[PDB]
Design a binder for these strands. Sequence first.
RNA 1: GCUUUACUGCAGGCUGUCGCUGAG
RNA 2: GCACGGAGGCGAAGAACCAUGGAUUUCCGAAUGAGAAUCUCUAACAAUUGCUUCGCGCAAUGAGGAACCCCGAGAACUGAAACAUCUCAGUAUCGGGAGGAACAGAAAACGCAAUGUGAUGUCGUUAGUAACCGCGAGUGAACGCGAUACAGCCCAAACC
Lengths: 46, 65, 119, 56, 194, 81
Amino acid sequence: GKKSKATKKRLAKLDNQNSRVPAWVMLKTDERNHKRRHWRRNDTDE
Amino acid sequence: TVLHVQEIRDMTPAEREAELDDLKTELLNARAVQAAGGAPENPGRIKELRKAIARIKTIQGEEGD
Amino acid sequence: PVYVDFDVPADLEDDALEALEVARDTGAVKKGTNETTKSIERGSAELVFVAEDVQPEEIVMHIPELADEKGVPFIFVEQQDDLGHAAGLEVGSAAAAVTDAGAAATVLEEIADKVEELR
Amino acid sequence: TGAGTPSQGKKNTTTHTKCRRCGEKSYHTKKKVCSSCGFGKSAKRRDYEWQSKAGE
Amino acid sequence: ARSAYSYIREAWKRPKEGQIAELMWHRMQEWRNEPAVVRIERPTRLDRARSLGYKAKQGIIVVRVAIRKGSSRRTRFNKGRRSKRMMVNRITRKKNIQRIAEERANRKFPNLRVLNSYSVGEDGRHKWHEVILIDPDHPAIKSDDQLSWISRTRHRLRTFRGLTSAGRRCRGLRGQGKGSEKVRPSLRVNGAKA
Amino acid sequence: SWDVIKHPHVTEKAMNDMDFQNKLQFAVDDRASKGEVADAVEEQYDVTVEQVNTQNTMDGEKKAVVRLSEDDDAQEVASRI
RNA sequence: GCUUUACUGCAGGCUGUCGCUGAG
RNA sequence: GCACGGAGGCGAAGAACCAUGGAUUUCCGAAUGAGAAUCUCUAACAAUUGCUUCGCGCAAUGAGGAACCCCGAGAACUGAAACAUCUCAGUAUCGGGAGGAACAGAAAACGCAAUGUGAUGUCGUUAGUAACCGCGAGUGAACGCGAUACAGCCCAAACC
Ligand SMILES: [Cl-]
Ligand SMILES: [Cl-]
Ligand SMILES: [K+]
Ligand SMILES: [Mg+2]
Ligand SMILES: [Mg+2]
Ligand SMILES: [Mg+2]
Ligand SMILES: [Mg+2]
Ligand SMILES: [Mg+2]
Ligand SMILES: [Mg+2]
Ligand SMILES: [Mg+2]
Ligand SMILES: [Mg+2]
Ligand SMILES: [Mg+2]
Ligand code: NA
Ligand code: NA
Ligand code: NA
Ligand code: NA
Ligand code: NA
Ligand code: NA
Ligand code: NA
Ligand code: NA
Ligand code: NA
Ligand code: NA
Ligand code: NA
Ligand code: NA
């Protein structure tokens, strides 16, 4: 497919939201990313 | 911090702009050092640089430049 | 048009307007269809002017027949703004009534004659 | 040809996409109309009383 | 003595007689070639207009609107219906043509508000009404002690809410006694039974 | 108002371009054209920009590969920051 | 759901009449 | 900040924090220069209107809002132990639109008929009364009264 500049921005964001909760945040909160999205098992929008 | 509001108002419109372009540069160089994984950082400043720039722009607006 | 049953030659209209102007200065004139209608009804009208470019025509339709059953003479003018200017207004006028001429009762009385003859 | 699984293979057509006005993946790129907010069809926002129970 | 206006009124009592009859026969020919809503410089029935609130003043507008004659232009049912509701031909709208005319004029002038309206005749298939609209934002109207009331925010879109002349009569609000039980203060408050 | 240059893009690949091709790599505002990038870069580092290549990245930012003239030395321009 | 000389109605078609609509 | 880490910083130049007012406020969005799945292309009140110095010069409209409110369009399941009028119901749902509340409102009223009442909402009652109805099932007011709150005016025309 041919993605536009805006679509590319959105997918970039989705990839970024796909990171894990940083380790330091665990220590800072004394203790999960519910928005984890696999490319195969999940489907993005548009 | 190192730059107070009184001191910004005691500047001439031209000194704020010169001071402004100066802060932007310190900022840009801090981001470069950061982008290079540079550790000689001091987080409290890259944050102060932003606020200082905001103050100057706020004052430039209040004074009429 | 529907209330116009005879055509007034250009030259006659000029004499009429001219007379009207000397009427506002020397005698008395009523400007406006409502004030004109009242002249004819009160009998104080000697010569009434009615424009022919009036739209809606309803505003003046009654002048003719009313004037007839009151003996009052009437003449048609083509331009609404000419009658108004002649009457002394900055605006136009659908109808005017020379209420007692002035230094024109002659020329006037004769214009009434020319029209009566114009059938 | 089976209307089930075998007919699912030709589905590589893009229709509903992220809408510019409401953010939902409901902007039908073929019709240029959002089935969720009405963008492309109505200046007013799409909304109906049947979207909730009658007395609520 | 009789006002000149009284003559316009008298003529319109019988629009199919005398001179007016001929004017109409003339006029309609041009009207039928005109659009749905046409702004006119002067009211065809001056007495009527002034009587309704018209003034030769800035911000006062008049427009003639054409509306088809007859009953409801209704689509026949596409699903189950009991005999009583299968109707098409005899169904008529609950809003009179004059009111439809007022709304169409008003939509053409989004910034203006309807003051009142009156009939100017009809032919075999049209009905014509002239609507008087007012510019609530024009000073001259804002400063007129007789029309300024229409400038109030509470009056935005009067026609669409039936606050008009024809609106109130068509709503059954004419009588203050017998017959207005389901009418006043509003049709909706009375469950919509009038 | 947004600024053209955001920060130097420093990665292994950016180094090779700097050391072997006299090019500098930046993260710039995605609304910036090659021309705007060329100008901004010259005014900030006092150098002569010979060519700019851009790319809208999968990071959501724009990357510009700015080649300097033989008169300028990328290695040195980058060493002062 | 379907049918028809089942019951009752509703579109549609035909036809008279009134309005548009006037002169001898 | 939630958020208790690591590093570093700010605060007696009175920070944090709270109140009020101001600044900033990307893109799409009624979305308004034009086009577009939030981007792009070469000055913009697009569109419809009022005024008009007839020039977008001065203005209006658009869209939103928990429900409430006003004006239009308007079912069927159901009840009648079937069903057609009736009923469900002017309900559900749809179209248009206002406000902080709407709407109504100073009698071509009422008609305890009077030597009487006196704008309009609303609440209590009048009353399941009068009235409607395959006179079946069902449907269903008002005047008055006791309260609440109270407020009365402007044009058109005559004559100028
Ligand atoms: Cl209105
Ligand atoms: Cl009483
Ligand atoms: K039924
Ligand atoms: Mg990755
Ligand atoms: Mg199938
Ligand atoms: Mg109410
Ligand atoms: Mg490229
Ligand atoms: Mg646009
Ligand atoms: Mg039953
Ligand atoms: Mg029975
Ligand atoms: Mg009922
Ligand atoms: Mg009663
Ligand atoms: Na996938
Ligand atoms: Na309007
Ligand atoms: Na009724
Ligand atoms: Na970056
Ligand atoms: Na079946
Ligand atoms: Na803000
Ligand atoms: Na505007
Ligand atoms: Na203009
Ligand atoms: Na039953
Ligand atoms: Na049955
Ligand atoms: Na019945
Ligand atoms: Na009593």
